Design a protein around this ligand. Structure first.
Ligand SMILES: Nc1ncnc2ccccc12
Lengths: 381, 111
């Protein structure tokens, strides 16, 4: 293969995305399964190492040896409060190696341990291959994104994951900076600009405030909830349905893992439909004890079940404005990123908070960070 | 008759799902034949329990494939006038649930 262009990689907690700037536009690259995002999963089996979709597809079968959430561990010490709190909820083992965490798995019948940057290098290798398969050219140069709150150790560990994967990391840029670049906020004429990035996706909630002057970016403040996302909204819907099944049939499905999974998968889909329709229908034959479960949920009912969680997204916004020493009227631009920003109620609450101001939302929220990174990668080539 | 061209689209998706169920069922039958083989085979009593537990990954993969079929069938919305599609959907779920119960007997008898 001949030499290829530079790419933009959004290395996410749950999913990763790769883009390329060509013919005056960014193209988000679909993976071998045709998906525009790839799960940040690595599975170790009795015979092979699986990455992405193939790794996520067999998690129910091999939970202990399937690694994900490496981004929550990357550049951290084993004794970090974040490491200690998160490991209780993971099915895979996290061990202490001289103060550093390592995921421990069974691989080809042997006990093996990996540093979080080695796991992230496997995901970056997959992103590099996805780009090469589409372009039909060798991909070496990339811009890799990190959250704005990442420290020196977390940024260095991410760059090290890039190097391990055979990538030449042109630059490591903040995720909110990448989203601002996607909308070309840096190219708008005039004086200094105060930009608010509202990132609700990939199991985390991040609010960042940035200032752009003559193409120069400065992070003024960061806030959020490290464990808030779409899954929480799904859980509320599942609880609502479980209670509805009890009311209608006087039967508890919650101890049948397969019934709960069928219900959960259907709620995830009904949630996505409620972003473009005002009602979602669900038909599940023989859900539990031979009972068919045919029901529906309105957008309003969904909004109500999640009312505290949705309203709660404004507390980090107020905290970020306070830490940046800014009033809400001083924000020139609001950018939505992450799949959950597609929820109409979340957009409504955010627009009403900014007294009817229009939101930058035309770029697919799941892809906007990779989009901005791809633009940056083309600029640095 | 009230048979609509739109219902043909749904019946075609259901027939593809039935063919996928037949393929997973053939793997479950090969697992049952391998299970029986080890049990009434040439291996010593101790070496049989190890060989049988080596089928666990395959039995778990079979269960997962039937679960993904259930999830796929669950995306279908069929109006009340789609009687043949509603009957085929019901029949297919029950067939998959009976194969899932067999997978559970295998899973409870290995390891
Ligand atoms: N993650 C999502 N949350 C809400 N609505 C959506 C709509 C389409 C795709 C993803 C989502």
């Amino acid at each position: 293969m001949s030499k290829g262009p530079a790419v933009g990689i959004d290395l996410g907690t749950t999913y990763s995305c790769v883009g390329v700037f060509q013919h005056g536009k960014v193209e988000i690259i679909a993976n071998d399964q045709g998906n525009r995002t790839t799960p940040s999963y690595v599975a170790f089996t009795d015979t092979e190492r699986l990455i992405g979709d193939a790794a996520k597809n067999q998690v129910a079968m091999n939970p202990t040896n399937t690694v994900f959430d490496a981004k929550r561990l990357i550049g951290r010490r084993f004794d970090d409060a974040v490491v200690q709190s998160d490991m209780k909820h993971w099915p895979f083992m996290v061990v202490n190696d001289a103060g550093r965490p390592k995921v421990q798995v069974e691989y080809k019948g042997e006990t093996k341990s990996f540093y979080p940057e080695e796991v992230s290098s496997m995901v970056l290798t997959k992103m590099k291959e996805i780009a090469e398969a589409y372009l039909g050219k060798t991909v070496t140069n990339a811009v890799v994104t990190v959250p704005a709150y990442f420290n020196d150790s977390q940024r260095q560990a991410t760059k090290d994951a890039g190097t391990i994967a055979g990538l030449n990391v042109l630059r490591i840029i903040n995720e909110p900076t990448a989203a601002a670049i996607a909308y070309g906020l840096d190219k708008k004429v005039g004086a200094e600009r105060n930009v608010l990035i509202f990132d609700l996706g990939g199991g985390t909630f991040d609010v960042s405030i940035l200032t752009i002057e003559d193409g120069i970016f400065e992070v003024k403040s960061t806030a959020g909830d490290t464990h808030l996302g779409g899954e929480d909204f799904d859980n509320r819907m599942v609880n609502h349905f479980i209670a509805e099944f009890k009311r209608k049939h006087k039967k508890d499905i919650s101890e049948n893992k397969r019934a709960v999974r069928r219900l959960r998968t259907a709620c995830e889909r009904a949630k996505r439909t409620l972003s473009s329709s005002t009602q979602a229908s669900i038909e599940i034959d023989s859900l539990y004890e031979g009972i068919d479960f045919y029901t529906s949920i309105t957008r309003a009912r969904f909004e109500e079940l999640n009312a505290d969680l949705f309203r709660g997204t404004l507390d980090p916004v107020e905290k970020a404005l306070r830490d940046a020493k800014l009033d809400k009227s001083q924000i020139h631009d609001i950018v939505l990123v992450g799949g959950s920003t597609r929820i109409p109620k979340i957009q409504k609450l955010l627009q009403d908070f900014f007294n009817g101001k229009e939101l930058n939302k035309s770029i697919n929220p799941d892809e906007a960070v990779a989009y901005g990174a791809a633009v940056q990668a083309a600029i640095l080539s | 008759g009230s048979n609509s061209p739109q219902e043909e689209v749904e019946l075609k998706k259901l027939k593809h799902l039935e063919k996928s169920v037949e393929k997973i069922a053939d793997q479950l039958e090969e697992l049952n034949k391998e299970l029986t083989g080890i049990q009434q085979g040439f291996l010593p009593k101790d070496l049989q329990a190890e060989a049988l537990c080596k089928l666990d990954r395959r039995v778990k993969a079979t269960i997962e494939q039937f679960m993904k079929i259930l999830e796929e069938i669950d995306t279908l919305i069929l109006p009340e006038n789609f009687k043949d599609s509603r009957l085929k959907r019901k029949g297919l779920v029950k067939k998959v649930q009976a194969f899932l119960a067999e997978c559970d007997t295998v899973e409870q008898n290995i390891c």
